[PDB]
Design an enzyme around this catalytic site. Structure first.
Site, short mmCIF file in Angstrom:
data_model
loop_
_atom_site.label_atom_id
_atom_site.label_comp_id
_atom_site.label_asym_id
_atom_site.label_seq_id
_atom_site.Cartn_x
_atom_site.Cartn_y
_atom_site.Cartn_z
N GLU A 35 -1.75 0.02 -17.56
CA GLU A 35 -2.03 1.47 -17.56
C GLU A 35 -0.82 2.33 -17.94
O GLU A 35 -1.01 3.30 -18.69
CB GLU A 35 -2.50 1.93 -16.16
CG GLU A 35 -3.93 1.60 -15.68
CD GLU A 35 -5.09 2.13 -16.60
OE1 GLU A 35 -4.80 2.99 -17.42
OE2 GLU A 35 -6.17 1.61 -16.55
N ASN A 46 -6.93 13.43 -22.36
CA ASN A 46 -8.18 12.98 -22.97
C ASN A 46 -8.85 14.24 -23.57
O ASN A 46 -9.53 15.06 -22.91
CB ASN A 46 -9.12 12.34 -21.93
CG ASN A 46 -8.42 11.15 -21.31
OD1 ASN A 46 -7.96 10.23 -21.96
ND2 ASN A 46 -8.21 11.10 -19.94
N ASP A 49 -12.82 14.96 -23.15
CA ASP A 49 -13.49 15.58 -21.98
C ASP A 49 -12.52 16.43 -21.17
O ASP A 49 -12.98 16.91 -20.13
CB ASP A 49 -14.16 14.45 -21.15
CG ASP A 49 -13.15 13.65 -20.37
OD1 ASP A 49 -11.95 13.82 -20.51
OD2 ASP A 49 -13.61 12.78 -19.68
N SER A 51 -9.80 15.94 -19.62
CA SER A 51 -9.23 15.46 -18.33
C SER A 51 -7.89 14.84 -18.70
O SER A 51 -7.58 14.53 -19.86
CB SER A 51 -10.14 14.44 -17.71
OG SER A 51 -10.20 13.26 -18.51
N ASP A 53 -5.04 11.68 -17.38
CA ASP A 53 -4.73 10.52 -16.51
C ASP A 53 -3.28 10.58 -16.05
O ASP A 53 -2.41 10.84 -16.90
CB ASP A 53 -4.94 9.18 -17.22
CG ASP A 53 -6.37 9.13 -17.71
OD1 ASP A 53 -7.28 9.37 -16.95
OD2 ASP A 53 -6.45 8.81 -18.85
N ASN A 60 -7.54 9.56 -13.00
CA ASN A 60 -8.08 10.66 -13.83
C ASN A 60 -8.39 11.91 -13.02
O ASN A 60 -8.87 11.89 -11.86
CB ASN A 60 -9.37 10.10 -14.49
CG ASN A 60 -9.99 11.11 -15.45
OD1 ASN A 60 -10.87 11.83 -15.04
ND2 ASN A 60 -9.40 10.97 -16.69
#
Length: 130
Positions: A35, A46, A49, A51, A53, A60
């Site tokens: 990750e 992102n 959408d 959002s 991370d 998220n």
């Protein structure tokens, strides 16, 4: 901070992750490696959408932490997303434990399915004294 591999492994062990909800320390290590590269300051936006991370587990902002600008945020960890960019990962681990208390478990992270599920992950904790 960028952890070294066995430093992270011993930190996660002391924070109670080994075997939490049936998930071995080597699976958590594989998740953090792919990750973030073990980097607490990692962020990924992102665009899709809206959002982001955050942190070592790339948690998220739509479902788990609040950053104020994610539409459709839920804040299931009841945490500011900035608590997931600290060098101290105790809050990141408290929230990662919350994520895997849902039925999906660690499968919640697609990186785990692509890089860790049904693979030998022993290598991530080898030599660390855990």
């Amino acid at each position: 901070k960028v952890f070294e591999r066995c430093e992270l492994a011993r930190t996660l062990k002391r924070l109670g992750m080994d075997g939490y909800r049936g998930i071995s320390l080597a699976n958590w290590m594989c998740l953090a490696k792919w990750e973030s590269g073990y980097n607490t300051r990692a962020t990924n936006y992102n665009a899709g959408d809206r959002s982001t991370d955050y942190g070592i587990f790339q948690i998220n902002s739509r479902y788990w932490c609040n950053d104020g600008k994610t539409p459709g945020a839920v804040n299931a960890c009841h945490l500011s997303c900035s608590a997931l960019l600290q060098d101290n990962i105790a809050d990141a681990v408290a929230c990662a434990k919350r994520v895997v208390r849902d039925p999906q478990g660690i499968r919640a992270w697609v990186a785990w399915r692509n890089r860790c599920q049904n693979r030998d992950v022993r290598q991530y904790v080898q030599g660390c004294g855990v």
